[PDB]
Amino acid sequence: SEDDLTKVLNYTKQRQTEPNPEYYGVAKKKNIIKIHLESFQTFLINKKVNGKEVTPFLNKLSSGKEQFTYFPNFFHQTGQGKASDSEFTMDNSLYGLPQGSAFSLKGDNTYQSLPAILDQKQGYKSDVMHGDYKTFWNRDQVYKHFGIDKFYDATYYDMSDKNVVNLGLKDKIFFKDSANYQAKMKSPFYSHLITLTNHYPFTLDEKDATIEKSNTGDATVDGYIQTARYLDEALEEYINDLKKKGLYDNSVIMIYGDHYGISENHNNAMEKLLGEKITPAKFTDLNRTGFWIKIPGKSGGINNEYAGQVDVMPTILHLAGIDTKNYLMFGTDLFSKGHNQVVPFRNGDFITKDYKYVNGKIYSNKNNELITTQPADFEKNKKQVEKDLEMSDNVLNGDLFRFYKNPDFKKVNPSKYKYETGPK
Numbered sequence: 552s553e554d555d556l557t558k559v560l561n562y563t564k565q566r567q568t569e570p571n572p573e574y575y576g577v578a579k580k581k582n583i584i585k586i587h588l589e590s591f592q593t594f595l596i597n598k599k600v601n602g603k604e605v606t607p608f609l610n611k612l613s614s615g616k617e618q619f620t621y622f623p624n625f626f627h628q629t630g631q632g633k634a635s636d637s638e639f640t641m642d643n644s645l646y647g648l649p650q651g652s653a654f655s656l657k658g659d660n661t662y663q664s665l666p667a668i669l670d671q672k673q674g675y676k677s678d679v680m681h682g683d684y685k686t687f688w689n690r691d692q693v694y695k696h697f698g699i700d701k702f703y704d705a706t707y708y709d710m711s712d713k714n715v716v717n718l719g720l721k722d723k724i725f726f727k728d729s730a731n732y733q734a735k736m737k738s739p740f741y742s743h744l745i746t747l748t749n750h751y752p753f754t755l756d757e758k759d760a761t762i763e764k765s766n767t768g769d770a771t772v773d774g775y776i777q778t779a780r781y782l783d784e785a786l787e788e789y790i791n792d793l794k795k796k797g798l799y800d801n802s803v804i805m806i807y808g809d810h811y812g813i814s815e816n817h818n819n820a821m822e823k824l825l826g827e828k829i830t831p832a833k834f835t836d837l838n839r840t841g842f843w844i845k846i847p848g849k850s851g852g853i854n855n856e857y858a859g860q861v862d863v864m865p866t867i868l869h870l871a872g873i874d875t876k877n878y879l880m881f882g883t884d885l886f887s888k889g890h891n892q893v894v895p896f897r898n899g900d901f902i903t904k905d906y907k908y909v910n911g912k913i914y915s916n917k918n919n920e921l922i923t924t925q926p927a928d929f930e931k932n933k934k935q936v937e938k939d940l941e942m943s944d945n946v947l948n949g950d951l952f953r954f955y956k957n958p959d960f961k962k963v964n965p966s967k968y969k970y971e972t973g974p975k
């Protein structure tokens with residue numbers, strides 16, 4: 552078992568990258584605000600429906616002219632755990648499981664998570680806020696193992712009928728109430744806001760909608776237009792509130808889609824909406840779910856690096872100025888010159904700058920045309936993808952952090968974490 556951990560640690564060493572001196576430590580002990588966009592795909596960016604921009608605020612952020620650096624080639628790497636898989640990868644730089652939910656199944660594994668590292672190295676307190684109850688996706692148990700200090704679940708918000716739709720709290724009230732809670736917290740904090748309204752089947756009361764549905768005939772695609780606009784408006788007002796509360800200028804703020812919202816079941820309607828046949832290659836392209844990051848003292852822009860959610864943890868750690876040599880991570884720092892531009896997907900497909908590998912076939916990213924003669928680096932990349940998934944799975948299945956005496960990590964005692972019922 553210890554030997555199994557050793558094999559994984561040795562494997563994760565080669566990819567390690569040095570921080571970019573332009574970015575190294577620039578956000579040390581600054582508040583970090585992390586905003587989850589439920590089911591958000593970047594095909595929405597700059598998309599109009601009936602002449603209206605679906606997501607006008609995110610469109611502005613994606614210009615690069617609004618203090619955020621936008622990554623247009625950024626992919627979720629999730630499976631059956633959906634939001635829970637995204638959360639798992641974002642805070643650990645590990646993959647979820649190939650079947651089922653790592654949160655549900657591995658919630659009492661030992662972890663060396665991002666929030667715990669920030670707490671230990673720099674005195675952060677970490678929190679999650681979400682307008683649903685705490686034991687969904689086993690979050691209550693998992694967060695204690697991740698070393699999250701506070702969980703503002705649905706008991707912290709008014710869950711009356713007027714404030715809820717679909718799975719729980721409406722995003723607009725969620726963001727408003729959440730900014731109010733953040734204003735009352737001691738710095739430095741690491742705060743993760745998990746949204747909810749832009750979730751299958753994508754239903755929104757007419758009174759709350761500010762855009763008409765598309766007319767594809769597919770209720771899922773047509774409804775998605777409205778819930779995406781609603782989320783964009785919710786986020787815009789949230790950013791305004793941060794400015795009013797003095798929580799904008801000196802915070803790291805990152806924004807990310809958790810995973811795709813529209814499956815291949817909806818290919819007929821998506822062809823109508825996007826004006827292009829949804830081939831397997833095109834569907835892979837549509838798994839772009841976006842990353843936006845604002846860093847104090849840095850201007851925004853557009854960074855075309857191909858990347859995945861596994862890369863977020865080492866990025867944040869390097870921004871804080873924390874040495875990552877001893878952390879078992881599969882991702883690499885987005886701003887580092889040596890960033891590894893290979894993005895494994897959970898099903899064994901993958902993407903690189905130049906090509907994608909989808910259901911056993913290779914396509915050029917330029918035109919999604921089939922590539923007939925193997926790229927020089929293909930076998931190397933395919934081996935990396937397969938081994939990354941196997942090695943990550945070995946950590947989870949073997950609960951291998953039990954055996955890691957990490958000099959840069961103090962073992963979490965999960966029993967020291969408790970999330971009290973909120974006032975509402």
Ligand SMILES: O=P([O-])([O-])OCC(O)CO
Binds near residue numbers: 633634684687718
């Ligand atoms: O995992 P999902 O289905 O994307 O999101 C659902 C929730 O976060 C529920 O609280």
Ligand SMILES: [Mn+2]
Binds near residue numbers: 633809
């Ligand atoms: Mn989700």
